[PDB]
Amino acid sequence: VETEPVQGCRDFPPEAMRCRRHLFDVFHATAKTFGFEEYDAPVLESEELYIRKAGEEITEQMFNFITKGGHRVALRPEMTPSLARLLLGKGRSLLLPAKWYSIPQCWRYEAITRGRRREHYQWNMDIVGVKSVSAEVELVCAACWAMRSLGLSSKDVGIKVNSRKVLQTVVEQAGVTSDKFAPVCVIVDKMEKIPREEVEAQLAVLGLEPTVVDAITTTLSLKSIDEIAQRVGEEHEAVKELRQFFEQVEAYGYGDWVLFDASVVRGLAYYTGIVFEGFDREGKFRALCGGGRYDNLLTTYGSPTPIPCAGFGFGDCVIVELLQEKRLLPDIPHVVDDVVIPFDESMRPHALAVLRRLRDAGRSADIILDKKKVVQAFNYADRVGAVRAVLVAPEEWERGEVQVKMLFAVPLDRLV
Amino acid sequence: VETEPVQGCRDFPPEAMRCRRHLFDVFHATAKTFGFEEYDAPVLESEELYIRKAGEEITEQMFNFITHRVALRPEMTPSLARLLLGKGRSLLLPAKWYSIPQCWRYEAITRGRRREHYQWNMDIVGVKSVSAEVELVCAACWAMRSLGLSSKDVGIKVNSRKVLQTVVEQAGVTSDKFAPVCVIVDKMEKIPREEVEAQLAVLGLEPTVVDAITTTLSLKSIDEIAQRVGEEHEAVKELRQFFEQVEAYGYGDWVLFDASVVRGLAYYTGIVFEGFDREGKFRALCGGGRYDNLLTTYGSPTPIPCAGFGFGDCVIVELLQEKRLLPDIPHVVDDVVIPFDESMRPHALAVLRRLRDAGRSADIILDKKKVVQAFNYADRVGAVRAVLVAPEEWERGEVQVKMLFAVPLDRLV
Ligand SMILES: Nc1ncnc2c1ncn2[C@@H]1O[C@H](COP(=O)([O-])OC(=O)[C@@H]([NH3+])Cc2c[nH]cn2)[C@@H](O)[C@H]1O
Ligand SMILES: Nc1ncnc2c1ncn2[C@@H]1O[C@H](COP(=O)([O-])OC(=O)[C@@H]([NH3+])Cc2c[nH]cn2)[C@@H](O)[C@H]1O
Ligand SMILES: [Cl-]
């Protein structure tokens, strides 16, 4: 007798489902406008695929189980690995650069509320085979367009930007093997989420000294690009890469949308370079979206030659919270072009004839299926939001006509 | 280093993915043309939901596990019923709901029955008469016709479980054993007569009642139905209406009566149907039927008539590929913006925005590459136009356009 859905999952009845479609049309449209090709993988993947274990939180937050037949498995918590699989699968036949997108469902055994439910759809845009920041620029501009398309602006939403190289330098400059670095990126991401002493505690636990911990704290708090230059020199990849990224987005004309934020690092250990996170200016919700460059990952899965990648994920939850707070998700109710009312059931076969004729003429149309009275029919027309009620009565039908109410006798040739 | 997908699942790279979109787009268009509303549930559901156990094959063919315990859906209908009942008193009827959910059966992989599949579900809820089924069956047809098929390629076989339900009820077996008989009897297509008859004797039934069933299944036409059960009978007059109404709608040649059709799912109550290719090459294209009692079974305080069908994304494709109706249509994009050298990049971007604003689909060379390479890229991604942004021209407020001379920035669109 049980009606509620599993755990923190969402049901999508028509009313809700429309909102989703509205949201998706946009992603697709934006992809197309930006020239991305759609792909998809199976939601269920091999457990083996997600073996990185870089101190992350995603490894245990897994819907994993065993089929017996074939080997053990898990429902995907992110698309990227599944992309990498498909890419590498394509092998020598893979033509580059490639620009691929997808709107896959994703499963994290996570903490339900607020806007981080146990299942979520995630719009992935990825550029593969592009070395320069030209990629990230495009990608970030793609998120913006989408949002702008949804009815947002730079004043509602921002995108914070940074490069992990800045950090990667600082660490490499003190005496710790890149060994412990990715874990530091996991730790350091928590600075937004929790207080400084507990981050600094976990970094001391990873073995690091206090004086190196200090350096990290400082870097994270660095105010601008100009200021980056002074801790690492204007002659430096990270520096000139950001300046290009920023000059290019300003050129494309989304200047107000982005800004530098030294704090941004991301919680996934395969990012190599530039990284970004979409946020609402008021600072109400978790990240709208997040992404960055991941050059080495494809080598990690075993590409005989390393393949640069950048790309982001864009959730379907937080974004909606924001649109609903900005009253940009007005329910647009179901409509249909025509409702065909058989006068009595003897007219039904003629009604059908008429219905076919409209559906052929490319109309969207509906027909009263059970025997019901004339009022009820009109009532139905109103419920389903019909633009027009075509009543098929006999007196008229014999004269080769039907009745039409808009929401007088019309012959068929003048109907459609 | 592992590239292949899990078990009998399909990867969908862009090339394949397009074929899917082409299919789904028809599914959606047809729905809309027929006035269905789209819905979706989570692919993962409670194990509890699929507890019927009417001698079926679907109960063990399950991707079940524990997190309460759960399983990945093998059919949408239960999940629909859940949502419907969930809506409660707020549910407005009749309702016409559709969806294209993925589904997971721990089944037998080849040929056209892979371990995962998408399934287009159309369901009418709250309609007593065959008017529903008619609509539903016409909906499948439209889709197919939309895909480029015809009555000569594909048929839809039709029948009513009441015909059988009578015959059994008329011999002395409780409805108790009936649904199991429908499971057994469905296998007649798939396997030989003696093994069906064996399993029915195993369900307890006599030989003389087994005979009656064999006979009913083989009944040639509706006229003939009349003679074993009277013209005055629900099943008989229901079919005659169904058939007269489809003929009216103008899909006469698409359907036909076949006494053998019963379906392998135990919740069907009345009319049932199955889509097939006339040549008899592949498993059922699609299948459905009326299921009035199911909603009471999940606990509706008043029974709610339903009909609806599922329409797989696998078999159908096998057929379209055999009829050469799935020509690969390769990716294309309106424009490719080539910065002459990297110094023009920021202007190139300016131009790219201007096109994307004008509603064009456009692309831009992202890495530094030579002029030829650019044009080569243009060809690869199938561009209709190459907008080279060179400096001599840019200063005069223009760009170079090659179609696959010099043009002013306001006249690219
Ligand atoms: N529990 C959740 N509930 C609702 N929304 C959620 C949830 N988790 C993630 N998201 C959406 O995905 C974005 C973060 O994805 P990610 O970067 O953590 O995972 C990725 O896939 C990264 N690999 C990004 C990426 C894609 N391609 C390259 N990098 C968030 O902004 C959020 O909107
Ligand atoms: N392994 C497979 N490979 C390819 N195609 C497959 C596979 N399994 C199922 N299908 C598709 O769905 C139909 C069979 O499922 P069904 O109709 O028996 O169960 C149902 O889904 C019921 N819920 C039908 C229904 C819905 N509403 C009322 N009745 C086939 O006609 C085919 O189109
Ligand atoms: Cl879709």
JSON list of N, CA, C and O in Angstrom, two decimals, chain A residues 3 11-12 15 21 33-34 37-38 40 69 85 90 99 109 131-132 134 138 334 359 366 369-370, chain B residues 3 11-12 15 21 34 37-38 40 67 82 87 96 106 128-129 131 135 298 331 356 362-363 366-367:
[
{"chain": "A", "resi": 3, "resn": "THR", "atom": "N", "xyz": [3.17, 4.42, -0.77]},
{"chain": "A", "resi": 3, "resn": "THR", "atom": "CA", "xyz": [3.19, 5.42, -1.85]},
{"chain": "A", "resi": 3, "resn": "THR", "atom": "C", "xyz": [4.48, 6.24, -1.96]},
{"chain": "A", "resi": 3, "resn": "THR", "atom": "O", "xyz": [4.86, 6.62, -3.07]},
{"chain": "A", "resi": 11, "resn": "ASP", "atom": "N", "xyz": [9.89, 11.70, -6.73]},
{"chain": "A", "resi": 11, "resn": "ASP", "atom": "CA", "xyz": [8.95, 11.31, -7.75]},
{"chain": "A", "resi": 11, "resn": "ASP", "atom": "C", "xyz": [8.79, 12.48, -8.70]},
{"chain": "A", "resi": 11, "resn": "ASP", "atom": "O", "xyz": [8.99, 13.64, -8.30]},
{"chain": "A", "resi": 12, "resn": "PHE", "atom": "N", "xyz": [8.44, 12.20, -9.95]},
{"chain": "A", "resi": 12, "resn": "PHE", "atom": "CA", "xyz": [8.19, 13.25, -10.93]},
{"chain": "A", "resi": 12, "resn": "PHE", "atom": "C", "xyz": [6.86, 13.06, -11.62]},
{"chain": "A", "resi": 12, "resn": "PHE", "atom": "O", "xyz": [6.81, 12.61, -12.75]},
{"chain": "A", "resi": 15, "resn": "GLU", "atom": "N", "xyz": [3.09, 17.41, -13.20]},
{"chain": "A", "resi": 15, "resn": "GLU", "atom": "CA", "xyz": [3.22, 18.79, -12.75]},
{"chain": "A", "resi": 15, "resn": "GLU", "atom": "C", "xyz": [4.69, 19.11, -12.50]},
{"chain": "A", "resi": 15, "resn": "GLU", "atom": "O", "xyz": [5.21, 20.11, -13.01]},
{"chain": "A", "resi": 21, "resn": "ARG", "atom": "N", "xyz": [11.52, 19.14, -17.47]},
{"chain": "A", "resi": 21, "resn": "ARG", "atom": "CA", "xyz": [11.65, 19.36, -18.91]},
{"chain": "A", "resi": 21, "resn": "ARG", "atom": "C", "xyz": [12.09, 20.79, -19.24]},
{"chain": "A", "resi": 21, "resn": "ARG", "atom": "O", "xyz": [13.03, 21.00, -20.02]},
{"chain": "A", "resi": 33, "resn": "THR", "atom": "N", "xyz": [23.64, 25.08, -28.93]},
{"chain": "A", "resi": 33, "resn": "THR", "atom": "CA", "xyz": [24.12, 26.41, -29.24]},
{"chain": "A", "resi": 33, "resn": "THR", "atom": "C", "xyz": [25.65, 26.44, -29.17]},
{"chain": "A", "resi": 33, "resn": "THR", "atom": "O", "xyz": [26.29, 27.14, -29.95]},
{"chain": "A", "resi": 34, "resn": "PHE", "atom": "N", "xyz": [26.23, 25.67, -28.25]},
{"chain": "A", "resi": 34, "resn": "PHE", "atom": "CA", "xyz": [27.68, 25.66, -28.06]},
{"chain": "A", "resi": 34, "resn": "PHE", "atom": "C", "xyz": [28.36, 24.55, -28.80]},
{"chain": "A", "resi": 34, "resn": "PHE", "atom": "O", "xyz": [29.57, 24.42, -28.75]},
{"chain": "A", "resi": 37, "resn": "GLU", "atom": "N", "xyz": [27.94, 17.43, -28.48]},
{"chain": "A", "resi": 37, "resn": "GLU", "atom": "CA", "xyz": [27.22, 16.23, -28.88]},
{"chain": "A", "resi": 37, "resn": "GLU", "atom": "C", "xyz": [26.76, 15.47, -27.65]},
{"chain": "A", "resi": 37, "resn": "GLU", "atom": "O", "xyz": [27.46, 15.37, -26.65]},
{"chain": "A", "resi": 38, "resn": "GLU", "atom": "N", "xyz": [25.57, 14.89, -27.73]},
{"chain": "A", "resi": 38, "resn": "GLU", "atom": "CA", "xyz": [25.02, 14.22, -26.57]},
{"chain": "A", "resi": 38, "resn": "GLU", "atom": "C", "xyz": [25.53, 12.80, -26.56]},
{"chain": "A", "resi": 38, "resn": "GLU", "atom": "O", "xyz": [25.64, 12.20, -27.63]},
{"chain": "A", "resi": 40, "resn": "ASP", "atom": "N", "xyz": [25.49, 9.08, -23.59]},
{"chain": "A", "resi": 40, "resn": "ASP", "atom": "CA", "xyz": [25.00, 8.49, -22.35]},
{"chain": "A", "resi": 40, "resn": "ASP", "atom": "C", "xyz": [25.70, 7.14, -22.09]},
{"chain": "A", "resi": 40, "resn": "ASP", "atom": "O", "xyz": [26.08, 6.43, -23.03]},
{"chain": "A", "resi": 69, "resn": "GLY", "atom": "N", "xyz": [26.51, -12.72, -11.34]},
{"chain": "A", "resi": 69, "resn": "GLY", "atom": "CA", "xyz": [26.80, -13.00, -12.75]},
{"chain": "A", "resi": 69, "resn": "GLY", "atom": "C", "xyz": [27.36, -11.82, -13.52]},
{"chain": "A", "resi": 69, "resn": "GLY", "atom": "O", "xyz": [26.62, -10.91, -13.92]},
{"chain": "A", "resi": 85, "resn": "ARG", "atom": "N", "xyz": [35.81, 6.15, -19.73]},
{"chain": "A", "resi": 85, "resn": "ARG", "atom": "CA", "xyz": [35.73, 4.77, -20.20]},
{"chain": "A", "resi": 85, "resn": "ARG", "atom": "C", "xyz": [35.33, 4.73, -21.67]},
{"chain": "A", "resi": 85, "resn": "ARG", "atom": "O", "xyz": [36.03, 4.16, -22.50]},
{"chain": "A", "resi": 90, "resn": "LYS", "atom": "N", "xyz": [36.70, 4.23, -27.42]},
{"chain": "A", "resi": 90, "resn": "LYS", "atom": "CA", "xyz": [36.72, 4.69, -28.81]},
{"chain": "A", "resi": 90, "resn": "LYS", "atom": "C", "xyz": [38.12, 4.52, -29.41]},
{"chain": "A", "resi": 90, "resn": "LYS", "atom": "O", "xyz": [38.25, 4.27, -30.60]},
{"chain": "A", "resi": 99, "resn": "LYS", "atom": "N", "xyz": [33.69, 17.52, -28.06]},
{"chain": "A", "resi": 99, "resn": "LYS", "atom": "CA", "xyz": [32.86, 18.27, -27.14]},
{"chain": "A", "resi": 99, "resn": "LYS", "atom": "C", "xyz": [31.58, 17.49, -26.83]},
{"chain": "A", "resi": 99, "resn": "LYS", "atom": "O", "xyz": [30.63, 17.54, -27.60]},
{"chain": "A", "resi": 109, "resn": "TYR", "atom": "N", "xyz": [25.19, 8.04, -1.70]},
{"chain": "A", "resi": 109, "resn": "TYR", "atom": "CA", "xyz": [24.60, 7.67, -0.41]},
{"chain": "A", "resi": 109, "resn": "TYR", "atom": "C", "xyz": [24.94, 8.80, 0.57]},
{"chain": "A", "resi": 109, "resn": "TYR", "atom": "O", "xyz": [25.69, 8.61, 1.53]},
{"chain": "A", "resi": 131, "resn": "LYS", "atom": "N", "xyz": [44.32, 21.78, -24.92]},
{"chain": "A", "resi": 131, "resn": "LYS", "atom": "CA", "xyz": [45.34, 22.14, -23.94]},
{"chain": "A", "resi": 131, "resn": "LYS", "atom": "C", "xyz": [45.05, 23.46, -23.23]},
{"chain": "A", "resi": 131, "resn": "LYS", "atom": "O", "xyz": [45.20, 23.55, -22.02]},
{"chain": "A", "resi": 132, "resn": "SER", "atom": "N", "xyz": [44.66, 24.48, -23.99]},
{"chain": "A", "resi": 132, "resn": "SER", "atom": "CA", "xyz": [44.59, 25.85, -23.46]},
{"chain": "A", "resi": 132, "resn": "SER", "atom": "C", "xyz": [43.36, 26.12, -22.61]},
{"chain": "A", "resi": 132, "resn": "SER", "atom": "O", "xyz": [42.43, 25.31, -22.56]},
{"chain": "A", "resi": 134, "resn": "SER", "atom": "N", "xyz": [41.23, 28.24, -23.29]},
{"chain": "A", "resi": 134, "resn": "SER", "atom": "CA", "xyz": [40.16, 28.40, -24.24]},
{"chain": "A", "resi": 134, "resn": "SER", "atom": "C", "xyz": [39.02, 27.45, -23.90]},
{"chain": "A", "resi": 134, "resn": "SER", "atom": "O", "xyz": [37.86, 27.83, -24.00]},
{"chain": "A", "resi": 138, "resn": "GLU", "atom": "N", "xyz": [35.08, 28.56, -22.67]},
{"chain": "A", "resi": 138, "resn": "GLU", "atom": "CA", "xyz": [33.92, 28.00, -23.31]},
{"chain": "A", "resi": 138, "resn": "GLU", "atom": "C", "xyz": [33.00, 27.36, -22.26]},
{"chain": "A", "resi": 138, "resn": "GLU", "atom": "O", "xyz": [31.83, 27.73, -22.12]},
{"chain": "A", "resi": 334, "resn": "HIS", "atom": "N", "xyz": [-0.43, 21.89, -18.24]},
{"chain": "A", "resi": 334, "resn": "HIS", "atom": "CA", "xyz": [-0.64, 21.13, -19.48]},
{"chain": "A", "resi": 334, "resn": "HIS", "atom": "C", "xyz": [-1.68, 21.81, -20.39]},
{"chain": "A", "resi": 334, "resn": "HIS", "atom": "O", "xyz": [-2.72, 22.29, -19.92]},
{"chain": "A", "resi": 359, "resn": "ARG", "atom": "N", "xyz": [-4.83, 15.19, -35.80]},
{"chain": "A", "resi": 359, "resn": "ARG", "atom": "CA", "xyz": [-3.49, 14.70, -35.47]},
{"chain": "A", "resi": 359, "resn": "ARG", "atom": "C", "xyz": [-2.60, 14.65, -36.71]},
{"chain": "A", "resi": 359, "resn": "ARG", "atom": "O", "xyz": [-1.40, 14.89, -36.62]},
{"chain": "A", "resi": 366, "resn": "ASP", "atom": "N", "xyz": [-7.16, 15.30, -28.43]},
{"chain": "A", "resi": 366, "resn": "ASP", "atom": "CA", "xyz": [-7.60, 14.39, -27.41]},
{"chain": "A", "resi": 366, "resn": "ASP", "atom": "C", "xyz": [-9.06, 14.09, -27.70]},
{"chain": "A", "resi": 366, "resn": "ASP", "atom": "O", "xyz": [-9.70, 14.82, -28.45]},
{"chain": "A", "resi": 369, "resn": "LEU", "atom": "N", "xyz": [-13.19, 9.46, -24.09]},
{"chain": "A", "resi": 369, "resn": "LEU", "atom": "CA", "xyz": [-13.06, 8.03, -24.33]},
{"chain": "A", "resi": 369, "resn": "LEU", "atom": "C", "xyz": [-14.25, 7.26, -23.76]},
{"chain": "A", "resi": 369, "resn": "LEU", "atom": "O", "xyz": [-14.79, 6.38, -24.42]},
{"chain": "A", "resi": 370, "resn": "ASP", "atom": "N", "xyz": [-14.68, 7.61, -22.56]},
{"chain": "A", "resi": 370, "resn": "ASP", "atom": "CA", "xyz": [-15.90, 7.02, -22.00]},
{"chain": "A", "resi": 370, "resn": "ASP", "atom": "C", "xyz": [-17.15, 7.80, -22.42]},
{"chain": "A", "resi": 370, "resn": "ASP", "atom": "O", "xyz": [-17.10, 8.96, -22.84]},
{"chain": "B", "resi": 3, "resn": "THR", "atom": "N", "xyz": [37.36, -1.13, -20.40]},
{"chain": "B", "resi": 3, "resn": "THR", "atom": "CA", "xyz": [36.50, -0.28, -21.27]},
{"chain": "B", "resi": 3, "resn": "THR", "atom": "C", "xyz": [35.05, -0.78, -21.47]},
{"chain": "B", "resi": 3, "resn": "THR", "atom": "O", "xyz": [34.14, 0.03, -21.61]},
{"chain": "B", "resi": 11, "resn": "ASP", "atom": "N", "xyz": [26.52, 0.91, -24.02]},
{"chain": "B", "resi": 11, "resn": "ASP", "atom": "CA", "xyz": [27.07, 2.25, -24.00]},
{"chain": "B", "resi": 11, "resn": "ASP", "atom": "C", "xyz": [26.36, 3.03, -25.08]},
{"chain": "B", "resi": 11, "resn": "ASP", "atom": "O", "xyz": [25.92, 2.44, -26.08]},
{"chain": "B", "resi": 12, "resn": "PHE", "atom": "N", "xyz": [26.27, 4.34, -24.89]},
{"chain": "B", "resi": 12, "resn": "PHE", "atom": "CA", "xyz": [25.70, 5.22, -25.90]},
{"chain": "B", "resi": 12, "resn": "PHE", "atom": "C", "xyz": [26.63, 6.37, -26.22]},
{"chain": "B", "resi": 12, "resn": "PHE", "atom": "O", "xyz": [26.46, 7.46, -25.72]},
{"chain": "B", "resi": 15, "resn": "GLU", "atom": "N", "xyz": [27.39, 8.73, -31.68]},
{"chain": "B", "resi": 15, "resn": "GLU", "atom": "CA", "xyz": [26.93, 8.08, -32.89]},
{"chain": "B", "resi": 15, "resn": "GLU", "atom": "C", "xyz": [25.67, 7.27, -32.57]},
{"chain": "B", "resi": 15, "resn": "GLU", "atom": "O", "xyz": [24.62, 7.45, -33.19]},
{"chain": "B", "resi": 21, "resn": "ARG", "atom": "N", "xyz": [18.05, 9.27, -29.62]},
{"chain": "B", "resi": 21, "resn": "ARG", "atom": "CA", "xyz": [17.29, 10.52, -29.69]},
{"chain": "B", "resi": 21, "resn": "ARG", "atom": "C", "xyz": [16.26, 10.49, -30.79]},
{"chain": "B", "resi": 21, "resn": "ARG", "atom": "O", "xyz": [15.10, 10.85, -30.57]},
{"chain": "B", "resi": 34, "resn": "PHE", "atom": "N", "xyz": [-0.97, 12.76, -29.21]},
{"chain": "B", "resi": 34, "resn": "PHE", "atom": "CA", "xyz": [-2.08, 12.02, -28.61]},
{"chain": "B", "resi": 34, "resn": "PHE", "atom": "C", "xyz": [-2.52, 12.57, -27.26]},
{"chain": "B", "resi": 34, "resn": "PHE", "atom": "O", "xyz": [-3.46, 12.07, -26.65]},
{"chain": "B", "resi": 37, "resn": "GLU", "atom": "N", "xyz": [0.67, 13.26, -20.95]},
{"chain": "B", "resi": 37, "resn": "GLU", "atom": "CA", "xyz": [1.60, 14.02, -20.10]},
{"chain": "B", "resi": 37, "resn": "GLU", "atom": "C", "xyz": [2.78, 13.18, -19.66]},
{"chain": "B", "resi": 37, "resn": "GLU", "atom": "O", "xyz": [2.61, 12.02, -19.31]},
{"chain": "B", "resi": 38, "resn": "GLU", "atom": "N", "xyz": [3.96, 13.75, -19.64]},
{"chain": "B", "resi": 38, "resn": "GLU", "atom": "CA", "xyz": [5.14, 12.99, -19.29]},
{"chain": "B", "resi": 38, "resn": "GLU", "atom": "C", "xyz": [5.30, 12.94, -17.77]},
{"chain": "B", "resi": 38, "resn": "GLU", "atom": "O", "xyz": [5.06, 13.94, -17.08]},
{"chain": "B", "resi": 40, "resn": "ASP", "atom": "N", "xyz": [7.95, 10.59, -14.60]},
{"chain": "B", "resi": 40, "resn": "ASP", "atom": "CA", "xyz": [9.11, 9.73, -14.33]},
{"chain": "B", "resi": 40, "resn": "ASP", "atom": "C", "xyz": [9.20, 9.40, -12.85]},
{"chain": "B", "resi": 40, "resn": "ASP", "atom": "O", "xyz": [8.83, 10.22, -12.00]},
{"chain": "B", "resi": 67, "resn": "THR", "atom": "N", "xyz": [20.63, -1.58, 0.81]},
{"chain": "B", "resi": 67, "resn": "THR", "atom": "CA", "xyz": [21.37, -0.36, 1.10]},
{"chain": "B", "resi": 67, "resn": "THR", "atom": "C", "xyz": [21.89, -0.33, 2.53]},
{"chain": "B", "resi": 67, "resn": "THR", "atom": "O", "xyz": [22.68, 0.54, 2.88]},
{"chain": "B", "resi": 82, "resn": "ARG", "atom": "N", "xyz": [2.14, 3.32, -8.07]},
{"chain": "B", "resi": 82, "resn": "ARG", "atom": "CA", "xyz": [2.52, 3.93, -6.81]},
{"chain": "B", "resi": 82, "resn": "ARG", "atom": "C", "xyz": [2.24, 5.43, -6.82]},
{"chain": "B", "resi": 82, "resn": "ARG", "atom": "O", "xyz": [1.52, 5.94, -5.97]},
{"chain": "B", "resi": 87, "resn": "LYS", "atom": "N", "xyz": [-0.94, 10.23, -5.47]},
{"chain": "B", "resi": 87, "resn": "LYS", "atom": "CA", "xyz": [-1.71, 11.44, -5.77]},
{"chain": "B", "resi": 87, "resn": "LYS", "atom": "C", "xyz": [-3.05, 11.45, -5.02]},
{"chain": "B", "resi": 87, "resn": "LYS", "atom": "O", "xyz": [-3.58, 12.51, -4.68]},
{"chain": "B", "resi": 96, "resn": "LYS", "atom": "N", "xyz": [-3.89, 10.53, -18.73]},
{"chain": "B", "resi": 96, "resn": "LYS", "atom": "CA", "xyz": [-3.13, 9.95, -19.84]},
{"chain": "B", "resi": 96, "resn": "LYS", "atom": "C", "xyz": [-1.65, 10.26, -19.64]},
{"chain": "B", "resi": 96, "resn": "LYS", "atom": "O", "xyz": [-1.19, 11.34, -20.00]},
{"chain": "B", "resi": 106, "resn": "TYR", "atom": "N", "xyz": [17.43, -9.15, -15.21]},
{"chain": "B", "resi": 106, "resn": "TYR", "atom": "CA", "xyz": [18.58, -10.08, -15.19]},
{"chain": "B", "resi": 106, "resn": "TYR", "atom": "C", "xyz": [18.24, -11.24, -16.14]},
{"chain": "B", "resi": 106, "resn": "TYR", "atom": "O", "xyz": [18.08, -12.38, -15.71]},
{"chain": "B", "resi": 128, "resn": "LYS", "atom": "N", "xyz": [-13.07, 3.07, -18.58]},
{"chain": "B", "resi": 128, "resn": "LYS", "atom": "CA", "xyz": [-13.65, 1.73, -18.57]},
{"chain": "B", "resi": 128, "resn": "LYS", "atom": "C", "xyz": [-13.60, 1.08, -19.95]},
{"chain": "B", "resi": 128, "resn": "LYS", "atom": "O", "xyz": [-13.13, -0.03, -20.08]},
{"chain": "B", "resi": 129, "resn": "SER", "atom": "N", "xyz": [-14.05, 1.80, -20.98]},
{"chain": "B", "resi": 129, "resn": "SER", "atom": "CA", "xyz": [-14.33, 1.20, -22.29]},
{"chain": "B", "resi": 129, "resn": "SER", "atom": "C", "xyz": [-13.07, 0.87, -23.09]},
{"chain": "B", "resi": 129, "resn": "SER", "atom": "O", "xyz": [-11.97, 1.24, -22.72]},
{"chain": "B", "resi": 131, "resn": "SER", "atom": "N", "xyz": [-12.41, 2.11, -25.84]},
{"chain": "B", "resi": 131, "resn": "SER", "atom": "CA", "xyz": [-11.96, 3.40, -26.35]},
{"chain": "B", "resi": 131, "resn": "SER", "atom": "C", "xyz": [-10.52, 3.65, -25.98]},
{"chain": "B", "resi": 131, "resn": "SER", "atom": "O", "xyz": [-9.76, 4.13, -26.80]},
{"chain": "B", "resi": 135, "resn": "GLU", "atom": "N", "xyz": [-7.26, 3.93, -28.61]},
{"chain": "B", "resi": 135, "resn": "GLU", "atom": "CA", "xyz": [-6.32, 5.03, -28.52]},
{"chain": "B", "resi": 135, "resn": "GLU", "atom": "C", "xyz": [-4.90, 4.49, -28.36]},
{"chain": "B", "resi": 135, "resn": "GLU", "atom": "O", "xyz": [-4.02, 4.76, -29.19]},
{"chain": "B", "resi": 298, "resn": "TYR", "atom": "N", "xyz": [-2.78, -2.89, -5.03]},
{"chain": "B", "resi": 298, "resn": "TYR", "atom": "CA", "xyz": [-1.84, -2.06, -4.26]},
{"chain": "B", "resi": 298, "resn": "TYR", "atom": "C", "xyz": [-2.55, -1.25, -3.18]},
{"chain": "B", "resi": 298, "resn": "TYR", "atom": "O", "xyz": [-1.90, -0.58, -2.38]},
{"chain": "B", "resi": 331, "resn": "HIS", "atom": "N", "xyz": [26.59, 14.54, -37.07]},
{"chain": "B", "resi": 331, "resn": "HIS", "atom": "CA", "xyz": [26.53, 15.82, -36.35]},
{"chain": "B", "resi": 331, "resn": "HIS", "atom": "C", "xyz": [26.78, 16.97, -37.31]},
{"chain": "B", "resi": 331, "resn": "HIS", "atom": "O", "xyz": [27.66, 16.88, -38.16]},
{"chain": "B", "resi": 356, "resn": "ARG", "atom": "N", "xyz": [25.78, 33.01, -31.55]},
{"chain": "B", "resi": 356, "resn": "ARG", "atom": "CA", "xyz": [25.03, 32.24, -30.58]},
{"chain": "B", "resi": 356, "resn": "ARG", "atom": "C", "xyz": [23.86, 33.04, -30.09]},
{"chain": "B", "resi": 356, "resn": "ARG", "atom": "O", "xyz": [22.84, 32.46, -29.78]},
{"chain": "B", "resi": 362, "resn": "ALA", "atom": "N", "xyz": [27.05, 27.37, -32.93]},
{"chain": "B", "resi": 362, "resn": "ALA", "atom": "CA", "xyz": [28.36, 27.68, -33.42]},
{"chain": "B", "resi": 362, "resn": "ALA", "atom": "C", "xyz": [29.47, 27.30, -32.48]},
{"chain": "B", "resi": 362, "resn": "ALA", "atom": "O", "xyz": [29.28, 27.17, -31.28]},
{"chain": "B", "resi": 363, "resn": "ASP", "atom": "N", "xyz": [30.64, 27.18, -33.08]},
{"chain": "B", "resi": 363, "resn": "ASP", "atom": "CA", "xyz": [31.78, 26.52, -32.49]},
{"chain": "B", "resi": 363, "resn": "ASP", "atom": "C", "xyz": [32.99, 27.40, -32.78]},
{"chain": "B", "resi": 363, "resn": "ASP", "atom": "O", "xyz": [32.95, 28.27, -33.65]},
{"chain": "B", "resi": 366, "resn": "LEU", "atom": "N", "xyz": [39.65, 26.21, -30.43]},
{"chain": "B", "resi": 366, "resn": "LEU", "atom": "CA", "xyz": [40.03, 26.53, -29.06]},
{"chain": "B", "resi": 366, "resn": "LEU", "atom": "C", "xyz": [41.54, 26.55, -28.88]},
{"chain": "B", "resi": 366, "resn": "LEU", "atom": "O", "xyz": [42.08, 27.47, -28.27]},
{"chain": "B", "resi": 367, "resn": "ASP", "atom": "N", "xyz": [42.24, 25.57, -29.43]},
{"chain": "B", "resi": 367, "resn": "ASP", "atom": "CA", "xyz": [43.70, 25.59, -29.39]},
{"chain": "B", "resi": 367, "resn": "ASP", "atom": "C", "xyz": [44.24, 26.37, -30.57]},
{"chain": "B", "resi": 367, "resn": "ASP", "atom": "O", "xyz": [43.56, 26.56, -31.58]}
]
